[PDB]
Design a binder for these strands. Structure first.
Ligand SMILES: Nc1nc2c(ncn2[C@@H]2O[C@H](COP(=O)(O)OP(=O)(O)OP(=O)(O)O)[C@@H](O)[C@H]2O)c(=O)[nH]1
Ligand SMILES: Nc1nc2c(ncn2[C@@H]2O[C@H](COP(=O)(O)OP(=O)(O)OP(=O)(O)O)[C@@H](O)[C@H]2O)c(=O)[nH]1
Ligand SMILES: [Mg+2]
Ligand SMILES: [Mg+2]
Ligand SMILES: [Mg+2]
Ligand SMILES: [Mg+2]
Ligand SMILES: [Mg+2]
Ligand SMILES: [Mg+2]
Ligand SMILES: [Mg+2]
Ligand SMILES: [Mg+2]
Ligand SMILES: [Mg+2]
Ligand SMILES: [Mg+2]
Ligand SMILES: [Mg+2]
Ligand SMILES: [Mg+2]
Ligand SMILES: [Mg+2]
Ligand SMILES: [Mg+2]
Ligand SMILES: [Mg+2]
Ligand SMILES: [Mg+2]
Ligand SMILES: [Mg+2]
Ligand SMILES: [Mg+2]
Ligand SMILES: [Mg+2]
Ligand SMILES: [Mg+2]
Ligand SMILES: [Mg+2]
Ligand SMILES: [Mg+2]
Ligand SMILES: [Mg+2]
Ligand SMILES: [Mg+2]
Lengths: 205, 422, 109, 120
RNA sequence: CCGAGCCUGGUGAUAGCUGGUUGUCCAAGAUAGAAUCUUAGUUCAACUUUAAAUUUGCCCACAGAACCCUCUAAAUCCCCUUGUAAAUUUAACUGUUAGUCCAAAGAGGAACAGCUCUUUGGACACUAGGAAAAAACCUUGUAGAGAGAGUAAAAAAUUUAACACCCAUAGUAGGCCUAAAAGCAGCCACCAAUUAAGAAAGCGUUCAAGCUCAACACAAAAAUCCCAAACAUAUA
RNA sequence: GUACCGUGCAAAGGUAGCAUAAUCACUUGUUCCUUAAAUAGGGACCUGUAUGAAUGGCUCCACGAGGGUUCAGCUG
RNA sequence: ACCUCGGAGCAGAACCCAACCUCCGAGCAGUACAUGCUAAGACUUCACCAGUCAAAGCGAACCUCAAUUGAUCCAAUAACUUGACCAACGGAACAAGUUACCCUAGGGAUAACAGCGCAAUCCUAUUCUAGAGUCCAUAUCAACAAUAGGGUUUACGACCUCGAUGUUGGAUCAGGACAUCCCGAUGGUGCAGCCGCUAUUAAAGGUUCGUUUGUUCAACGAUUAAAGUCCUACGUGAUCUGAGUUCAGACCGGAGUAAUCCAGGUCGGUUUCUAUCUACUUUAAUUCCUCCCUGUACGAAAGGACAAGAGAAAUAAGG
């Protein structure tokens, strides 16, 4: 079964209890599915966002059509939509209780792999349609190999080491210099200024 | 949206609407397949209710209507009701929705939903909006007292645009814009066919009831592996043309169309407009019937009624080649009526005979003439004929420097040849 | 559809932290469940509130938990515990400050 | 929620580079801080306002002498973004009762015990 | 001037509602909530004011404050020192209990709203400077005169898409398949020779024929009329 | 069950008449006449489960500064 | 729909925290009859009321449960004690509709018009290269999606205005945008020609008259080169009209016992203002058609052009 597996619209056992839109699941760096597993290529999410069944279908159809099943295999690195998003009836006034469950999404944080590909192939053979999928994804995304991912991580480390700026967001935020924590967020103490809402700034050091 | 549907089938007993050809079990099976087509929901409950006055507003009698609403309100798991009654009038839909507390769908609305949800085309979306324009009683399941007095009362001596005036204005404007957009899309679809008409490709429209095997027959005829027939109802959404070769070596377009359905306003379905206009402009019509299906007679009657309502040319109605598909399902079948080709699309049993038959039909319809013509070699007359007309056979006279070519040529191509190479 | 849930906070928790001088009878901590267990010179009310049985200094410690043998649920938990495992709980103690009393010369008979 | 900030201890651990830059030996640390409020307490938390009042830095650009002891240092850490801290230097040593009235705090942070107002 | 006349009187009816509430000067002064036919109000709390008694008030070192739950935040409570001068209690009261934005953690909405609702903090409902004008962003506040001085915050930067040239025989038109389908309609094999070439990576052919590739060689657009003027180079 | 053949219930199951009505909506109902063209008007309908008989139903002579439509003429 | 009480999240760690926010529950039951009497010290649902825990002592033996309830007065009782799904649950001892016949006090603290925020809805443009288009993504489109822009709709918010911002349609006059309907120039075409389609540029000028309907619109009739999309308080009522439109009258159908009512129909129904201030009051034209080109180019036919030239007009401006 090398081809990418089908993803259901909603979990077979639907959730009955509406739950809050905890945007923290989109905010910040990704702590899961950050490394390669049984594959050599992937789509890396350079930003946070929610993936819908429409996005899943786009990914599945494009990758399945453009891949070579006898030499390439693909695997999801993100679970099927599970978080329920609720919408009220069109034209409803505010109040009257939380809306009914409308759709299911799956959160994705910056730095996560969405799909992972492998097999008897090199990067250039796959990067085309992987980049197409990444560009059509709801968040900033990039087709990345193991080598390219390691290269970008090493480049980030090198920039952090050799930056000539005496002042860094990490240092200022941690020391509360100028009392900037009045303006910053507690999450910023760990984001080090590289994340702003759902957006991840890669050039940011 | 994971809906739960109660399939309410009005079994018409006596009077107009009494179906001699088909049975209520068959009709409810058809409706169940229809609703399953949409991938979103399925039939949770089915009720066949006897009715003797199907033309009245409530369809059913007073007692039967009370009984139905009793069950519909008692059972909470139902999200909507599918009324297998073709098209409901606006008052009937309003009354049934108010009584039952849930959205009520008819065959027309369900088919519009099939088109919108499966073939996400602008035609389908606009048609759904057009049919959805009647909008009142937003809060179903409960009658809401409103007390609309004092809203927009006269300020000095007059009032501005009131409600039911703004609603009328929006209704008129939306209808106008939807119609204009649909006209633009129709013009674009017509534009798509200009090159085909100019090249004068013989075009054949494969028509028939859903699941008769139109797509499978076209696949068998053309030899294209890309064509993917499905067992789903209304699987062949959208109209597409495929090239094929006949025994006379002629190239012919088969127009795979959307399958027809019984008790459905095809003329009023916008998504069907491509199919209807393509059959209208078709040179020949290929009528595919699934004789294996028990409702074959009703299916034939429905398709023939739709074709008659299309007001197609009399010669187009005539010579419509009838093909009985799925013959393999019937163990031993003999076509009693003449001029019908029994074929098995999956097994390709009668495909050669069908090919010969509709090849003769195309030769008759398109007006192309089969003739032997003398062409001087090295003139490029032969190459011109190769490009512009089908070439059944070539026999070159070595001594004379000419060739006798048996060719099927249209009037336009023949005139062009005579002028270009006198 | 969602009714209730309007109850106010119980204002429960610790009333006397460590190092606080506490008189006899003072409530040290009110709790719904057994968060802090009673230690030396600390009594439990019907509602699991901890009160000082003596006058002294409150001290919070971590001590091994050995339930009464008739506490069937805790005994079952212990019986299912792996060998070498020891349960610990937070206990509140009142280190008495004053002595019980003094011997005073009352009469020189 | 915006809350009081806990400065990690590693921030206040000077390095040899810092010692060279700022001219202060880790051994034999200075005894007294000269603290001047260079920033307004307006638009700052009430706890910082109260700490400034406790340190007696209500007036801006008004030097105040404080002990270089852990508790005063903790308060100064709390309100460090509003103040300038320098080491008090005593080139002639502590002022004596005889010269107590002739002292002056020069901008360099030195408390000279003779102020003649004459050219050198 | 009749949903029930007019006049007089009770009558200065009552109004939680609107409006008004008149000398000078100084000072303190914007704080959680509960109940209520109650959310246009009031009483009690909280805050605030005054006077008086007393002694601790604030900041805060260790140590200490739970499992559930596998991980799980900024913090908080408590708290000697220390820097500070306030705090508690007693007595007498009013007024505020219809609130805005900003930063942060959240919830609802549509990860809309100058939207709504909680929490921490700030500012505003007070002065001044700045962000163009400017309640809420930044700087800064305790007050007067000065035709002195050092400063705080404080002025946006960006201009971005060329590209190879040459050359191609070949066992054969690889087989089957088909009317022929010959690298090039479909499937299987997919080698191999020439110094160098995939039984061909793309066009084209009715099928061929003919042309190429790998291989040899060599960003944005709206409705009265754009909107300071301008300036790239004289030493922070 | 296939209009009439049986049955339930009710106090009786809306009868005659008229009918897109000044008569919820659907509504610009569907037709014919009328106009070059009519959401108007008039005549009709298996036309009302929200018509209908002294809460009066239909027809009709006269009459009306009542409300519609219209021939011809007339005219700013 | 809810109104009182309790548990869990929001509210991760002392306490406390809203929501017509998310979820669960309660208005008991069981056992006991010392489930007796007293009494330090404490907690406390942010007030009070109320509610909690409890050492020691007497007297004895040797309560479970999260909520599981309700004050005062007043009744019943000899007393002890008991009494409200007083659930609008801090509880008037006992009182419903309707109002357009309406009235007063206020409120822009609060809705309808308009503006404003926003852009769900709506509209527009790109990216994606699946799929339509006989072949062929890109002549013309286009699914799943992505990125932007606009502020024409319906909303949503309730920020100015309720000691009045008069608000549908029409007349009159129009100012403006271009996202161009016609006229101009231009690239592509599945552009043979004629018609077209699509895109760039262009807002100087123009963009019809009628039948029904209050219609804006829609349909239809006849035209036109075309009969554009919008903004302007859905421009413009101190310039006009009031046909529609939930003031007072009345009828029909329906609701109700009735008053009366129905975003149902229908017949009728008062349009004020003498201008103080601002502003303003005399600022090289387009288009169609006729002939001819010409039955020519083009085309198999059907049909059928440009450009050049000549002549006629129509409108607009000025006389
Ligand atoms: N036994 C048999 N089954 C057939 C035959 N032809 C078609 N079928 C079956 O019927 C299905 C019809 O699918 P399509 O041919 O796509 O249907 P269609 O005729 O295009 O009709 P729509 O899906 O309604 O458009 C096939 O997929 C088969 O499952 C036949 O000749 N014999
Ligand atoms: N505590 C209490 N008082 C009551 C109760 N029932 C009546 N009362 C008293 O009586 C008042 C109510 O009067 P009603 O409503 O006439 O009482 P009723 O019992 O229904 O009728 P009557 O006996 O005729 O008065 C209350 O306010 C009390 O004073 C009850 O259940 N508990
Ligand atoms: Mg009123
Ligand atoms: Mg709670
Ligand atoms: Mg009078
Ligand atoms: Mg008064
Ligand atoms: Mg003052
Ligand atoms: Mg000063
Ligand atoms: Mg080459
Ligand atoms: Mg008329
Ligand atoms: Mg208390
Ligand atoms: Mg109450
Ligand atoms: Mg009336
Ligand atoms: Mg009034
Ligand atoms: Mg508005
Ligand atoms: Mg307001
Ligand atoms: Mg508000
Ligand atoms: Mg006024
Ligand atoms: Mg333009
Ligand atoms: Mg508007
Ligand atoms: Mg009127
Ligand atoms: Mg009536
Ligand atoms: Mg009227
Ligand atoms: Mg009149
Ligand atoms: Mg007037
Ligand atoms: Mg005038």
């Amino acid at each position: 079964k090398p081809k990418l597996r089908f993803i259901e619209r909603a979990p077979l056992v639907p959730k009955v209890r509406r739950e809050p839109k905890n945007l923290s699941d989109i905010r910040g760096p990704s702590t899961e599915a950050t490394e390669f597993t049984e594959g050599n290529f992937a789509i890396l999410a350079l930003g946070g966002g929610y993936l819908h069944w429409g996005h899943f279908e786009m990914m599945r159809l494009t990758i399945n059509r453009s891949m070579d099943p006898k030499n390439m295999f693909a695997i999801w690195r993100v679970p099927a939509p599970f978080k329920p998003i609720t919408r009220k009836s069109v034209g409803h006034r505010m109040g009257g209780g939380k809306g009914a469950i409308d759709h299911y999404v799956t959160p994705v944080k910056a730095g996560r792999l969405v799909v992972e590909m492998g097999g008897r192939c090199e990067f250039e053979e796959v990067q085309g349609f992987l980049d197409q999928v990444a560009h059509k994804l709801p968040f900033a995304a990039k087709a990345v190999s193991r080598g390219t991912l390691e290269k970008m991580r090493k480049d980030q480390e090198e920039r952090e080491r050799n930056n000539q700026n005496p002042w860094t967001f990490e240092r200022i935020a941690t020391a509360n210099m100028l009392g900037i924590r009045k303006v910053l967020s507690p999450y910023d103490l760990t984001h080090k200024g590289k994340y702003w809402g759902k957006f991840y700034m890669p050039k940011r050091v | 949206g994971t809906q739960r549907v109660c399939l309410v089938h009005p079994d018409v007993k006596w009077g107009p609407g009494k179906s001699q050809m088909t049975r209520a079990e068959w009709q409810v099976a058809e409706a169940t397949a229809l609703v399953h087509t949409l991938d979103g929901w399925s039939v949770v409950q089915t009720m066949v209710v006897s009715t003797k006055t199907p033309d009245r507003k409530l369809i059913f009698g007073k007692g039967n209507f009370e009984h139905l609403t009793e069950k519909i309100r008692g059972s909470p798991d139902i999200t909507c009701v599918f009324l297998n009654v073709e098209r409901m009038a606006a008052p009937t839909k309003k009354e049934l929705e108010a009584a039952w507390g849930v959205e009520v769908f008819d065959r027309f609305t369900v088919v519009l939903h099939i088109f919108r949800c499966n073939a996400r085309t602008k035609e389908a979306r606009l048609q759904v909006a057009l049919a959805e324009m009647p909008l009142h009683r937003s809060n179903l399941k409960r009658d809401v007292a409103h007390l609309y007095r004092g809203v927009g009362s006269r300020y000095i001596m007059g009032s501005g645009e009131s409600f039911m005036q703004l609603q009328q204005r929006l209704l008129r404007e939306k209808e106008a814009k939807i119609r204009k957009a649909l006209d633009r899309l129709r013009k674009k679809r017509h534009l798509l066919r200009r090159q085909r008409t100019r090249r004068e490709f013989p075009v054949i429209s494969v028509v028939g009831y859903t699941n008769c095997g139109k797509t499978t027959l076209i696949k068998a005829l053309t030899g294209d592996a890309a064509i993917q027939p499905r067992d789903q109802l209304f699987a062949t959404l959208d109209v597409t043309a495929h090239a094929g070769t006949l025994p006379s070596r002629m190239t012919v377009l088969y127009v795979d169309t959307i399958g027809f359905l019984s008790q459905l306003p095809h003329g009023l379905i916008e998504s069907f407009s491509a199919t209807l206009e393509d059959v209208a402009h078709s040179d020949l019509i290929l009528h595919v019937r699934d004789v294996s299906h028990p409702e074959a007679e009703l299916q034939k009657c429905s398709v023939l009624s739709t074709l008659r309502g299309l007001q197609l040319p009399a010669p187009l109605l005539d010579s419509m080649v009838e093909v009985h598909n799925k013959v393999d399902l019937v163990p031993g079948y003999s076509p009693t009526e003449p001029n019908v080709v029994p074929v098995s699309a999956l097994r390709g049993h009668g495909l050669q005979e069908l090919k010969a038959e509709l090849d003769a039909a195309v030769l008759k319809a398109t007006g192309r003439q089969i003739l032997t013509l003398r062409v001087r070699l090295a003139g490029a007359q032969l190459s011109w004929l190769y490009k512009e007309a089908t070439v059944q056979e070539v026999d070159v006279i070595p001594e004379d420097g000419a060739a006798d070519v048996r060719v099927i040529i249209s009037n336009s191509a023949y005139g062009k040849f005579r002028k270009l190479f006198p | 559809k969602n009714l209730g849930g309007k109850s106010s906070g119980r204002r429960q928790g610790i009333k006397k932290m460590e190092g606080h001088y506490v008189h006899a009878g003072n409530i040290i901590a009110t709790q719904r469940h057994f968060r802090w267990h009673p230690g030396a010179h600390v009594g439990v009310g019907k509602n699991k509130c901890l009160y000082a049985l003596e006058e002294g200094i409150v001290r919070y410690t971590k001590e091994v938990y050995v339930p009464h043998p008739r506490n069937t649920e805790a005994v079952d938990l212990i019986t299912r515990l792996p060998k070498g495992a020891v349960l610990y709980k937070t206990f509140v103690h009142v280190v008495p400050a004053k002595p019980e009393g003094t011997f005073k010369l009352v009469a020189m008979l | 929620k915006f809350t009081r900030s806990r400065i990690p201890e590693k921030v206040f651990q000077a390095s040899p580079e810092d010692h060279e830059k700022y001219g202060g030996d880790p051994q034999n640390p200075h005894k007294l801080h000269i603290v001047t409020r260079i920033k307004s307490t307006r638009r700052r938390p009430y706890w910082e306002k109260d700490i400034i009042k406790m340190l007696g830095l209500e007036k801006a650009h008004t030097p105040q002498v404080h002990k270089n002891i852990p508790s005063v240092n903790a308060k100064l850490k709390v309100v460090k973004h509003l103040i300038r801290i320098k080491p008090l230097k005593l080139p002639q040593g502590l002022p004596a009762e005889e010269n107590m009235s002739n002292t002056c705090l020069k901008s360099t942070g030195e408390l000279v015990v003779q102020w003649h107002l004459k050219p050198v």
